[PDB]
Amino acid sequence: QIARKLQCIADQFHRLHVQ
Amino acid sequence: EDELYRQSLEIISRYLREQATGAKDTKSGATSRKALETLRRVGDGVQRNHETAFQGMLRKLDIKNEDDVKSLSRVMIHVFSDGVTNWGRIVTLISFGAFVAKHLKTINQESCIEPLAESITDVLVRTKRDWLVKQRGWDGFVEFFHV
């Protein structure tokens, strides 16, 4: 699903950028 | 009458249009300026890292005209259906929006970019206003992603 994928991407984005 | 909507639309529409055209636009300036710069840095990064997934999503959506925009509107609402709102989800939606705007430019539907920006702004300002206000709007957006 598209909405679920966007959610997943948003999660990866945060974990990659948290400092 | 709605300053938060106007500013949000200005930021999102400008980003989507310059991503599509490849040129910045000439025509609350302080906050909006910094937000746009931030959006360029962060949003371009999302599109780079997730270009393959974005492509797949686009194809499944099948956007050919203005009425197809509602299908993205329904998708975007669904993103926040779990009751969770954060800047990560917001930038991701705006980034996918820029990706779609590029697609609209390639298929000669450039006139669909504004309604695209308005639908994205509708989801964020109209349904998440309280949260946005709590983050001090786009000032908080700038601070959250400051590096």
Swiss-Prot record, chain B:
Its main location: membrane. Keywords: Apoptosis, Cytoplasm, Developmental protein, Differentiation, Isopeptide bond, Membrane, Mitochondrion, Nucleus, Phosphoprotein, Transmembrane, Transmembrane helix, Ubl conjugation. Cleaved by CASP3 during apoptosis. A motif (BH1) lies at residues 78-98. One of its GO terms (biological process) is cellular homeostasis. There is a cross-link at residues 24, 27 (Glycyl lysine isopeptide (Lys-Gly) (interchain with G-Cter in ubiquitin)). It is found in: Membrane; Cytoplasm; Mitochondrion; Nucleus, Nucleoplasm. A motif (BH3) lies at residues 35-49. A motif (BH2) lies at residues 130-145. Changing residue 34 to R: No effect on ubiquitination. Induction: Expression increases early during phorbol ester-induced differentiation along the monocyte/macrophage pathway in myeloid leukemia cell line ML-1. Rapidly up-regulated by CSF2 in ML-1 cells. Up-regulated by heat shock-induced differentiation. Expression increases early during retinoic acid-induced differentiation. One of its GO terms (cellular component) is cytoplasm. GO terms for molecular function: BH3 domain binding; channel activity; protein heterodimerization activity; protein transmembrane transporter activity. Belongs to the Bcl-2 family. Interacts with HIF3A (via C-terminus domain). Interacts with BAD, BOK, BIK and BMF. Interacts with PMAIP1. Interacts with BBC3. Isoform 1 interacts with BAX, BAK1 and TPT1. Heterodimer of isoform 1 and isoform 2. Homodimers of isoform 1 or isoform 2 are not detected. Isoform 2 does not interact with pro-apoptotic BCL2-related proteins. Interacts with RTL10/BOP. Interacts with BCL2L11; may sequester BCL2L11 to prevent its pro-apoptotic activity. Interacts with GIMAP5 and HSPA8/HSC70; the interaction between HSPA8 and MCL1 is impaired in the absence of GIMAP5. Involved in the regulation of apoptosis versus cell survival, and in the maintenance of viability but not of proliferation. Mediates its effects by interactions with a number of other regulators of apoptosis. Isoform 1 inhibits apoptosis. Isoform 2 promotes apoptosis. This is Induced myeloid leukemia cell differentiation protein Mcl-1. It comes from Homo sapiens.
